[PDB]
Design goal:
monomer; D-Maltodextrin-Binding Protein, domain 2; four-stranded mixed beta sheet; binds a molecule of 2 linked components (GLC-GLC); sugar binding protein,signaling protein; Receptor for activiated protein C-kinase 1; WD repeat
Length: about 675
């Protein structure tokens, strides 16, 4: 629920949540309000989840870099401190938490990684990364390692990658270009390669995580480690005689860590937005509040000036700020998480050996800039997935058709396991199922296969309820009339047939001069109820529009030099996209019945479909799923397949809400796309 009357706070496990808890107890004393401080695992990922449904904590803590994404998804209440309060914090700390001109959280402290060394094992720490391999050989002889730090999180490896040129998003004229990603340039490659070499020459292991490196350093086994201010406590209790100094340089350049600003945001759904502000502003952001947290685990250089005046006296803090100066404050734009996930994968694969540096970064480069990504994969078909149907009511299930001769009802789980599971496999056709469609109910499926027949399926009971025997050759397409009372099909027998629901052919648009002269590959109903019509693709290179009332030919659309294997109709029934052999997508004006323009794809098109919302046109091509913006006539996405044989999309269909693109491939795998 909401939890009106108390304050649920979330902060990371590596921070002084106990000290904060104290602050919470002090608030409760003066307020009479219970403060609960919890530190869930992966709280940064759960938050956007729970906050979306209206649940979650009242206050969430994390480095600023992740708040832009939360704000964007409306998960954060706008904060508005009095000018008096604002002056208490450094202006630059406020900028860290300012998104689209608004303050979305209270800044707490400036975090920056530093080189932490054991003064007893290494009086003079290396000034450069390059002298570390020799240093490790020297220490290894004495049963000690030179360096150990968390190689699992990109946060720790980024300072070295960025050192000689690597960057996340190009910054220019006071703005970030989210398409200009710098993770695979010469600089980033040089840094990651050096790192990987360290692992190859065994100066550090690819599996070293946070606890391993912290234990090793605190137990005096390794001379140096890399960490933030929050680690100084544990080392204190370990009695190690350490120092905190400038990170080593690489190729003469200083390591450039991404600087985080620990921040506290208030849940958009919280019913204690006021209690939250009173707490953060009058209890936490005070010389007392911070000191209570700082004693638990150091915060770093705090936003609050008054208290920073004391902290800046600590040399470890001065060292923190020197490394901070060599790097830069993290952007808070939504793309940051994509950048982090991208870089994390790259480092791990390059480190594990699964991929080469160039290989790993190249992919990271793509994932960091990627808009539409691979939300998941659904596997069950043992052969090519020929068609995909999505429920009109946007329910949590879809249906697929495959050359394995079956259709599958998928239950969209989304759970870590898979995006969906084969809830029921329906068999019955004696040859490849080429196309499938759902009823308005979303309760029945209508299929067409190369066995020349169509079948109605009762999805719930799992059985075929009707065979449509009429065509004399392979059936290549099927469609349901808007009111689901009429069924249409296309065949290699060059005809288009109309059927009722009882399996009787009510009408046949014969191969006559009016009809097609070759295979009819596709037939679709136009959503327009004013002029009942259907369009048809054909290997006779034409497209035909038909009056559903009298079944009379409206018009023949010529413009293709090869077979047209597919046709899609805009949701409004005004446009119509056609495609096939010649690689060009012709967009027509249904109403008038004339060409509007082309859209080169340079690849054979297999399927088409417009977006439910956006002015988008998607094309299943042998060279990826091309997506143009019907307004700019420009490509906005070109999705290829990466297993890390020629594999290509044969079918695709959007979820009713336009949020997910389902697509079948030749390898029998169904790939889910979306934000
Ligand atoms: O490395 C990916 C990860 O880096 C940062 O998380 C830091 C955090 O800022 C520090 O305060 C401390 O908790 O160490 C974390 C690394 O494990 C980013 O803030 C985070 O968004 C990103 O995923």
């Amino acid at each position: 629920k909401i939890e009106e009357g108390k304050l649920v706070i979330w902060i990371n496990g590596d921070k002084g949540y106990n000290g904060l808890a104290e602050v919470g107890k002090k608030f409760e004393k003066d307020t009479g309000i219970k403060v609960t401080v919890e530190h869930p695992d992966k709280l940064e990922e759960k938050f956007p989840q729970v906050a979306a449904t209206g649940d979650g904590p009242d206050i969430i803590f994390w480095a600023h870099d992740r708040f832009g994404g939360y704000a964007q998804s409306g998960l954060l209440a706008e904060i508005t401190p009095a000018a008096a309060f604002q002056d208490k914090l450094y202006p630059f700390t406020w900028d860290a938490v300012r998104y689209n001109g608004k303050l979305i959280a209270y800044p707490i402290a400036v975090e920056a990684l530093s080189l932490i060394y054991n003064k007893d094992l290494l009086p003079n720490p290396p000034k450069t990364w390059e002298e570390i391999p020799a240093l490790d050989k020297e220490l290894k002889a004495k049963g000690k390692s030179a360096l150990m730090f968390n190689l699992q999180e990109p946060y720790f490896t980024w300072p070295l990658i960025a050192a000689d040129g690597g960057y996340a998003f190009k910054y220019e004229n006071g703005k970030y270009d989210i398409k200009d990603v710098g993770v695979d340039n010469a600089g980033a490659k040089a840094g990651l390669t050096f790192l990987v070499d360290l692992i190859k020459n065994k100066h550090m292991n690819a599996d070293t995580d946070y606890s391993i490196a912290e234990a090793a350093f605190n137990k005096g086994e390794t001379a140096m480690t890399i960490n933030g201010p929050w680690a100084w406590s544990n080392i204190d209790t370990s009695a190690v005689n350490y120092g905190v100094t400038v990170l080593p340089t690489f190729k003469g350049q200083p390591s450039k860590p991404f600087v985080g600003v620990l921040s506290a945001g208030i849940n958009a759904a919280s019913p204690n937005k006021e209690l939250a502000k009173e707490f953060l502003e009058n209890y936490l952001l005070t010389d007392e509040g911070l000191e209570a947290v700082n004693k638990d685990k150091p915060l770093g250089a705090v936003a609050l000036k008054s208290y920073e005046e004391e902290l800046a006296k600590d040399p470890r803090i001065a060292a923190t700020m020197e490394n901070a100066q060599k790097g830069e404050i993290m952007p808070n734009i939504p793309q940051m998480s994509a950048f982090w996930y991208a870089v994390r994968t790259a480092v791990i694969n390059a480190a594990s050996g699964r991929q080469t540096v160039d290989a790993a970064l190249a992919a990271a480069q793509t994932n960091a800039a990627a808009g539409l990504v691979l939300k998941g994969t659904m596997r069950a078909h043992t052969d090519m997935v020929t068609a995909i149907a999505t429920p009109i009511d946007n329910a949590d299930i879809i249906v697929s058709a495959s050359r394995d001769k079956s259709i599958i009802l998928w239950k969209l789980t989304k759970d870590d396991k898979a995006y969906g599971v084969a809830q029921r496999r329906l068999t019955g056709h004696s040859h490849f199922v080429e196309d499938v469609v759902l009823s308005s109910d979303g309760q029945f499926a209508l299929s067409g296969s190369w066995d020349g027949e169509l079948r109605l399926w009762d999805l719930a009971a799992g059985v075929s309820t009707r065979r449509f025997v009429g065509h004399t050759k392979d059936v290549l397409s099927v469609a349901f009339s808007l009111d689901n009372r009429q069924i249409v099909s296309a065949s290699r027998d060059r005809t288009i047939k109309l059927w009722n629901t009882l399996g009787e052919c009510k009408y046949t648009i014969s191969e006559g001069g009016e009809g097609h002269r070759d295979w009819v590959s596709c037939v679709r109903f136009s959503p327009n109820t004013l002029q009942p019509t259907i369009v048809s693709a054909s290997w006779d290179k034409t497209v035909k529009v038909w009056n559903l009332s009298n079944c009379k030919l409206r018009s023949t659309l010529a413009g293709h030099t090869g077979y047209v294997s597919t046709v899609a109709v805009s949701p409004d029934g005004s446009l119509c996209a056609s495609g096939g052999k010649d690689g060009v997508v012709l967009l027509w004006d249904l109403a008038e019945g004339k060409k509007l323009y082309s859209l080169e794809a340079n690849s054979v098109i297999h399927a088409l479909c417009f977006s439910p919302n956006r002015y988008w046109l998607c094309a299943a091509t042998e060279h990826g799923i091309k997506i143009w913006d019907l307004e700019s006539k420009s490509i906005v996405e070109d999705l290829k397949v990466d297993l890390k044989k020629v594999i290509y999309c044969t079918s695709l269909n959007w979820s009713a809400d336009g949020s997910t693109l389902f697509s079948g491939y030749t390898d029998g795998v169904i790939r889910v796309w979306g934000i």
